[PDB]
Design a protein around this ligand. Sequence first.
Ligand code: ATP
Ligand code: ATP
Ligand code: ATP
Ligand code: ADP
Ligand code: ADP
Ligand code: ADP
Ligand code: MG
Ligand code: MG
Ligand code: MG
Ligand code: MG
Ligand code: MG
Ligand code: MG
Lengths: 482, 482, 482
Amino acid sequence: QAIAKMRTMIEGFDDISHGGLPIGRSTLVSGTSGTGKTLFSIQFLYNGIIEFDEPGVFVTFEETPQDIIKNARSFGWDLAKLVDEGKLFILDASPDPEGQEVVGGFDLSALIERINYAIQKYRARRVSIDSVTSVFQQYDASSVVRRELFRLVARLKQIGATTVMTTERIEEYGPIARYGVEEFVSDNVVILRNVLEGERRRRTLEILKLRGTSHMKGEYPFTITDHGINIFPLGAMRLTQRSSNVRVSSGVVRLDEMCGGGFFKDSIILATGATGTGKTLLVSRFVENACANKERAILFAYEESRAQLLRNAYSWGMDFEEMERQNLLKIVCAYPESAGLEDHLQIIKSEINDFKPARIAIDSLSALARGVSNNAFRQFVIGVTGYAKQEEITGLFTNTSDQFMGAHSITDSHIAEITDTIILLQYVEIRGEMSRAINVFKMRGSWHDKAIREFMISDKGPDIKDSFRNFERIISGSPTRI
Amino acid sequence: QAIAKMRTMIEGFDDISHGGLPIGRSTLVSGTSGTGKTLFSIQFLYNGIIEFDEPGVFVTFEETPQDIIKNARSFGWDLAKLVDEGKLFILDASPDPEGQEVVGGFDLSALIERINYAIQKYRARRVSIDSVTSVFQQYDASSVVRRELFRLVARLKQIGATTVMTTERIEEYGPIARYGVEEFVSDNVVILRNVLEGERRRRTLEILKLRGTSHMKGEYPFTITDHGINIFPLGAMRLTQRSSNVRVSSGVVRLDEMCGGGFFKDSIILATGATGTGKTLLVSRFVENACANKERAILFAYEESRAQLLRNAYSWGMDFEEMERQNLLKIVCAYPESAGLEDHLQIIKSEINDFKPARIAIDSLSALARGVSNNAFRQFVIGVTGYAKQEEITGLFTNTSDQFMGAHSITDSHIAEITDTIILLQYVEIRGEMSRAINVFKMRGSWHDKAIREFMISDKGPDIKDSFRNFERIISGSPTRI
Amino acid sequence: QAIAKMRTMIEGFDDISHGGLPIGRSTLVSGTSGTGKTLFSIQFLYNGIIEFDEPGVFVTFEETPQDIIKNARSFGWDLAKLVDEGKLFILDASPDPEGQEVVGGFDLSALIERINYAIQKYRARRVSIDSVTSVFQQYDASSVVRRELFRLVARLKQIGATTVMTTERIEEYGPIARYGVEEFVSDNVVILRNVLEGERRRRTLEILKLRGTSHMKGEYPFTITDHGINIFPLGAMRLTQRSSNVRVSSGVVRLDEMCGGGFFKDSIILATGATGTGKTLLVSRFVENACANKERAILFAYEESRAQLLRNAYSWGMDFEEMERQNLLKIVCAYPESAGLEDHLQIIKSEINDFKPARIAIDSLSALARGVSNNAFRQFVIGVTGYAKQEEITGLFTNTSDQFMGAHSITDSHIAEITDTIILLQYVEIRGEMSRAINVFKMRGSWHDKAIREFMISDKGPDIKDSFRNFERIISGSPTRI
Ligand SMILES: Nc1ncnc2c1ncn2[C@@H]1O[C@H](COP(=O)(O)OP(=O)(O)OP(=O)(O)O)[C@@H](O)[C@H]1O
Ligand SMILES: Nc1ncnc2c1ncn2[C@@H]1O[C@H](COP(=O)(O)OP(=O)(O)OP(=O)(O)O)[C@@H](O)[C@H]1O
Ligand SMILES: Nc1ncnc2c1ncn2[C@@H]1O[C@H](COP(=O)(O)OP(=O)(O)OP(=O)(O)O)[C@@H](O)[C@H]1O
Ligand SMILES: Nc1ncnc2c1ncn2[C@@H]1O[C@H](COP(=O)(O)OP(=O)(O)O)[C@@H](O)[C@H]1O
Ligand SMILES: Nc1ncnc2c1ncn2[C@@H]1O[C@H](COP(=O)(O)OP(=O)(O)O)[C@@H](O)[C@H]1O
Ligand SMILES: Nc1ncnc2c1ncn2[C@@H]1O[C@H](COP(=O)(O)OP(=O)(O)O)[C@@H](O)[C@H]1O
Ligand SMILES: [Mg+2]
Ligand SMILES: [Mg+2]
Ligand SMILES: [Mg+2]
Ligand SMILES: [Mg+2]
Ligand SMILES: [Mg+2]
Ligand SMILES: [Mg+2]
């Protein structure tokens, strides 16, 4: 029949690969130094032993087994334990650090026989090699490498164990492997990258090909945590979601009225407008209302410290510290520069999975956009939006405009298109003095107030008034009286 | 007379090539690892045997016949069956995986004689080689490769069988082949690419040349499905279409009136405007009307999940689930990121060919533009537009504006130029409050209402009113009363 | 257990590295000529001896010990003293400057044994090598280098001392090391760069990898001072800050009133507007008020010399020279071109740490933006903003607009988003003549006056009037009377 696959149990990878790696065949994993190729290899064998009770063999040329164990330990697991139990075997084929003699092609034959023995001895199902170039570096000829890799691949295929071979690159977008032949010999090729753009590094995983089967294509970003490799295949995200007719309060009565009876629990709300329009007040009231009803909520802060958030909240009549004491409100403060954009996604998911909030709020999306491309930014927002909706978490987001009394409160980001409810705030010029205006622009699941209303901010929170009747051109930031 | 060609029966390819490959000559197919060169080769021989009852020979150097069969099976056909029947022959010229000796140029002579024998034995008409570099890699000299390929090409020409040779590249836009001679020796050259741009891969096929004959030029995108290679030569699409005078209802009476008695069945309708203007309502009513008249329709959703579409439809009085139960309405939900733009085209065609809809609708074209270049986007839209018109399927499309009460509802995409009927929606400022406006901008086949009218959205669907008499500058988003 | 690290006591480095270098392992430090690789090496051993009383070994191939001592002295410390005391040892393995014979691989074995001896003799904990290529340059083979470095790394690992090896590059964004193998052999890789962009050099440090542990990623800028290497890991900066409810006067009564009772002591104030709106007056009054209350303040001047600042201050009734005499006011004048942007940050911190000001003011941020990218500029501003708030220093900043009576006083820089209080100044056209207007746009911790007021400048300082009642479109720069 068709080719079967073996699950790696690596988050994201198994979805990108459509079920894991081809069984009874090798896969070649490449990349430049620092991409964590050896982490993939260890995590693969590790998960096999733990999850499927499948023994495996790790072949090492470049590292003493002592360091392999010591390094793996940083991810919360003990490989030495698995070795003692007869589940994991490490085949030491490293060169002598005190002086190593030159060898010929017999080295490959000797290697394979030792691997075969180890596989049979431990009935290994999963095998990996830290560096195939350990036996190619011995010579310059690329034609020889083609043949030598062919022999290694075909021989492990004879055995039938699933194999993960590791090779290496100099360039990110250059040749897949050093000799320019290896990627043609291998039937299954995966490349890891650690691309430097601007001043930042972004890790990605790609499956170049899998002969005889299917997979997702393109570069899929990933990070490395204390649990090992975590891949974020946004294209694998589903639109299968549970809708609701449940309403929740924003903490602001006139706003709830404008939204036709509050906001939907499963909706995503985006508040936009110029800095100083009180977006942080709407956020504070949102999380406060959740706490008022004994619901858990998380605020992700980027522009203001906790000490300042507490002060500003008190000036608006909100006791943030009390909400923390009751374990209802969490404050998560971090600079955009403290983590990669993909790490912010992981942080948000981690805090949510741990605290199990009913609602979350983001202090500023425009802050996160600060250090990234438009593509990186929109993918982040989509990922968060999807997750929050799939988890049925009420979400409140903000996006700051740079138009100082210029109205025209629109986004180059275009997040409103994927968001449910849009709240627009702006400054206006009235009788020679500045004021503020609020409008509910849209709401997918309901009727909403179309009026453009004046509002002010007091020590009791927001103060919403009636519409600007007999004015024109409010949307320009400079209304005319008529 | 003139050079005759042999049809490959590969979709798109035979149109690009103007009738297939030159008969009695070789064609050299190149490309980087992962381009599926071996798929073209197998599909070529396979179709010959099935469609024209033409036996063929597959020469393998890099892969065991067992894997060739096993891999081919993923595309829904059994090559082993064809081998047993004496239709397909695989010539195994692979190196010994357990140790291979060095050989000279006699290897090429021996190869050709075995190929000649196999061709005569099975009366093969179609022959292919998986890797010509299998006998070039043996040495570094490029001058030798020129001669060695010349010998192979000329010898197979003596036989008269049509040949598809495969070679390989390192770079996408670099040399056609490794030694920089092969593309001059071969008289017919085809290059496959798997170009990485941004984070995504895009497959293309190009015919570089065919000596003595004609072909289409440039890169033509393609994808790979469970049926093998599927090429999309948009430039080969025809303007020969059947026009009609049949009208269909949009589900909205006042809109049908503005269009002069409904929309034409063979027309393409584009609705544009800012988010929240109710474009999703017009789409829902469009497919609903088709179902009301017992016509099949497909909705392609990108921005909202099925669960949410059902909720929003119910809030507007439309029972989507009932229309699904009667097998009239289909909901196809996918993220733009879940597939390549060219795959979305294939998905749309597949669903249409299967369900045979009278009408289709696209939830958002701007969503599909999100992750692609302007060139990739416009080609997609043209391809869909052409197909839908050729198939006489009523089509409804949308394009979201980013102008929040800014009117000026125009597209940087310029899809209106190829579309028949244009509907414009916008937000306006009236008496200090927001409202909506609708206008039929054009309709190629009819008279239409030129008025700019106010409208609202209720639980019964759209509510269209009369024109904004005694107002000026409506089109700016900020009308003045006079 | 997990891998332990050794603190280098190098500012910034220990935070980027999450605790310093892995213990009992080597780290490879690379970079092009002029990156100061030898400074890192010396500073590392130096700090070990001084701070932790840890003896060390410096291995030299390229420089006579006499020059190593002489060069180190420029940073305020005497290595010769440490040698005499038996704390520091320099191993001289340099070639004979009067003629050097060719040697083989025995040179590496001899080297290591001498290093081992020196380590044991002085009980060294910290070891470093100035140039590993000193024994690789002897031959061209890259395969040999792989092995030779492996031997050196593994051998020093046997000893257990923490090692800092130095290698070299030709290109900034090219291969990590000359032979393209070294970065794979080493388990811990750090790269220094001195990147030339435009006409300026910018130094950065990056940790490419640390096997078995964690670190911050990406390029982190640094400078070199008379105290050695000083790294500025902005991403490691904290949002943990102490808020306050203390108010301070700006020196301008009507402005203090508009801000609701003065400005907060812990706040950052940004004044924006066209050139000539009197931003330098607000700055002068700010520092003057601090002095009036016997508080120390520093003015950082970029656009005007001290002599001119004194003249302009006297014309506005402010005796700057007297404030200097009392050691309350400091004037720091420098051109933006006189130092790197990162050096301006270091200068600001240095002057603050020395003088212990209650308040600081920046004459022009737009001046500093003049010669730098938007990314370099915003990181600078964030760094200063963070530092000033963490140190509880009242900060006043300015940003000049290029709109001559065009109002629209907005910033492409978007510094207002991270700043607390925003003051906007603009020119307006009134009755055929130019005038000025002032508005408090926002204040995070308080109520503020929303009015747009007229103002003038006299010899007594600023003169603020009442609001522009019965005017419209003030924000455009061209108000209309109505
Ligand atoms: N606890 C951790 N948390 C986060 N990142 C970690 C942690 N522990 C290790 N890392 C990261 O894991 C990376 C994986 O190293 P790995 O050896 O697998 O990369 P590699 O591509 O194989 O490198 P090499 O070419 O040297 O073999 C390390 O470089 C380090 O950046
Ligand atoms: N069922 C399938 N659906 C979609 N794609 C598939 C399916 N089965 C296989 N593929 C794709 O078909 C591609 C064709 O592989 P093929 O060997 O022809 O490429 P190639 O250029 O010849 O590769 P190579 O250089 O290794 O020989 C595979 O890499 C895989 O991405
Ligand atoms: N007092 C000082 N103040 C500022 N910079 C200084 C001072 N003294 C030295 N420098 C800088 O320190 C740099 C460090 O030189 P160093 O040898 O460490 O660089 P390097 O990368 O190792 O150079 P090389 O490749 O020659 O060995 C010098 O090039 C010089 O620019
Ligand atoms: N006690 C108060 N009384 C009146 N207005 C206040 C008070 N405290 C703060 N403000 C208002 O709050 C605004 C800050 O709102 P905020 O939500 O932080 O704006 P942003 O959109 O940037 O997030 C200030 O500009 C000021 O107008
Ligand atoms: N029951 C309702 N009654 C009144 N208005 C509604 C109702 N349900 C939804 N709406 C309106 O429908 C709008 C959404 O229209 P939609 O077609 O989804 O906009 P879009 O152009 O983005 O696709 C909301 O902004 C709201 O004005
Ligand atoms: N004695 C004075 N009397 C009146 N106006 C003065 C006097 N001295 C200077 N000015 C005003 O001060 C302005 C300069 O203000 P300044 O703070 O230097 O502007 P900038 O925003 O560039 O920093 C001059 O354009 C002038 O209008
Ligand atoms: Mg490794
Ligand atoms: Mg804010
Ligand atoms: Mg192939
Ligand atoms: Mg929509
Ligand atoms: Mg040096
Ligand atoms: Mg000035």
